[PDB]
Ligand binder design. Structure first.
Ligand code: SF4
Lengths: 98, 232, 55, 49
């Protein structure tokens, strides 16, 4: 997902991300935690730079939302994006949606 | 002990002495007027008394009550000067009651007075011998057609002073405009009612946050914002 | 309850509005007037590029 | 001096809002309310966050 920033006077930027669930169900019915990774990117200079490395690990069947704060923002015409480095789940038992 | 010159002390210890002359200088430079020199009596030749080059003018003036005591309250001497001809009335209506000016008192023995005064001259003239004390006018206790009376005070008086003296306010800036603390020096921007203007004569700060934002000087705001939320 | 006070020491945090800004002249423990105070949720990032959430 | 009445009446210029109800001290609503029913411990429980 990508969006751009147009406001003139801002000093820091906060990204609120999360996962809908992370429970992993075995064939018998046991539940185990899983993990997922994200990248938050800002277009400094001419190439995208990954500001942060994010890893969420645990068991939950409801949304868990976390926030991280940025700084040293480039000049305003910059744009931002977030991307996923974990392969999209194919089996229905995995349930790790970013 | 004041560093009085030796010849003055030798004059003090003598059995028979020369006349003692008190010379008054009223300084209105800080207020905005000119300095005035007076003396109680004329010289021997019927001319104004000459000390150094000042040429103090004859005029009925007297000051009584001077003292050196720090145990109790301040001294507050009194000075009386006549205004039969209306001089003091004109200085009082021009210079706002002559309140805040300096009064300087000198005591010089007639022996050391300038040679111009005496008809035969003075062989002992020495312009360095005097005793000086400074005061500041405080009030005009009386003013009539006969005389006018002032009460002096020390320059270092502590009547209306509280020490820390700086108030933390939520909405008002305490600095002086364009002062050292405010640190603004630029084109005229606004009036005291946050109305745009460009004349330099009517450029004042409203001491409000908008009045400060007109100058883009929010960084140096005197007051501390959003305290009233906490105090509540 | 009989605690005795003096004019040159204060060890607790006082309200800000309408009060003077104090002056400190020597080495001493101080409690100071509060200009701001808030409670919010804390960000997970600790300032580094790598951040790990959960176990 | 009768001329001081008009000087006193003119008041001053105040900055802000007379109502001042945009932001008092009433707390806002809690951000993310979620309730989860888990039978992992062998019993039905509700976890509010
Ligand atoms: S409000 Fe701003 S511009 Fe006005 S005196 Fe205070 S610091 Fe200076």
């Amino acid at each position: 997902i990508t969006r751009t920033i147009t406001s003139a006077n801002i000093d820091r930027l906060r990204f609120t991300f999360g996962v809908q669930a992370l429970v992993e169900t075995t064939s018998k019915g046991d539940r185990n935690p899983s993990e997922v990774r994200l990248l938050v990117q800002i277009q400094r200079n001419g190439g995208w730079v990954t500001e942060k490395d994010i890893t969420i690990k645990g068991k939950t069947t409801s949304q868990y939302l976390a926030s991280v704060v940025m700084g040293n923002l480039p000049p305003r015409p910059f744009n931002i994006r977030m991307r996923r480095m974990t392969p999209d789940s194919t089996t229905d038992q995995l349930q790790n949606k970013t | 002990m004041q560093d009085i010159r030796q010849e003055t002390l030798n004059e003090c210890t003598r059995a028979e002495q020369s006349a003692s002359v008190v010379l008054w200088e009223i300084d209105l430079t800080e207020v905005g007027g000119e300095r005035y020199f007076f003396c109680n009596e004329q010289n021997e030749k019927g001319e104004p008394v000459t000390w150094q080059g000042r040429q103090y003018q004859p005029y009925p003036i007297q000051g009584s009550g001077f003292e050196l005591n720090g145990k109790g309250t301040s001294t507050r001497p009194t000075l009386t000067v006549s205004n039969l001809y209306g001089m003091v009335t004109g200085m009082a209506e021009d210079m706002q009651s002559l309140v805040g000016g300096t009064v300087v008192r000198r005591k010089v023995y007639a022996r050391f007075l300038d040679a111009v005064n005496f008809v035969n001259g003075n062989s002992y003239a020495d312009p360095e011998q005097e005793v000086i004390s400074r005061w500041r006018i405080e009030q005009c206790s009386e003013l009539s057609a006969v005389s006018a009376s002032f009460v002096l005070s020390t320059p270092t008086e502590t009547d209306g002073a509280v020490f820390p003296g700086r108030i933390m306010l939520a909405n008002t800036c305490t600095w002086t405009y364009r002062g050292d603390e405010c640190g603004y020096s630029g084109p005229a921007v606004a009036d005291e009612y946050d109305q745009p203007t460009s004349d330099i004569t009517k450029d004042k700060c409203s001491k409000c946050l908008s009045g400060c934002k007109f100058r883009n000087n929010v960084g140096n705001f005197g007051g501390f914002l959003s305290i009233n939320k906490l105090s509540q | 309850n009989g605690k005795q006070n003096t004019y040159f020491s204060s060890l607790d945090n006082m309200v800000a509005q309408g009060n003077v800004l104090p002056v400190l002249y020597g080495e001493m423990r101080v409690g100071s007037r509060v200009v701001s105070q808030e409670i919010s949720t804390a960000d997970e990032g600790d300032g580094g590029q790598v951040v790990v959430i959960g176990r | 001096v009768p001329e001081k009445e008009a000087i006193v009446d003119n008041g001053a210029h105040f900055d802000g809002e007379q109502s001042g109800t945009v932001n008092g001290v009433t707390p806002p609503a809690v951000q993310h309310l979620t309730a989860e029913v888990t039978a992992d411990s062998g019993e039905y429980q509700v976890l509010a966050r």
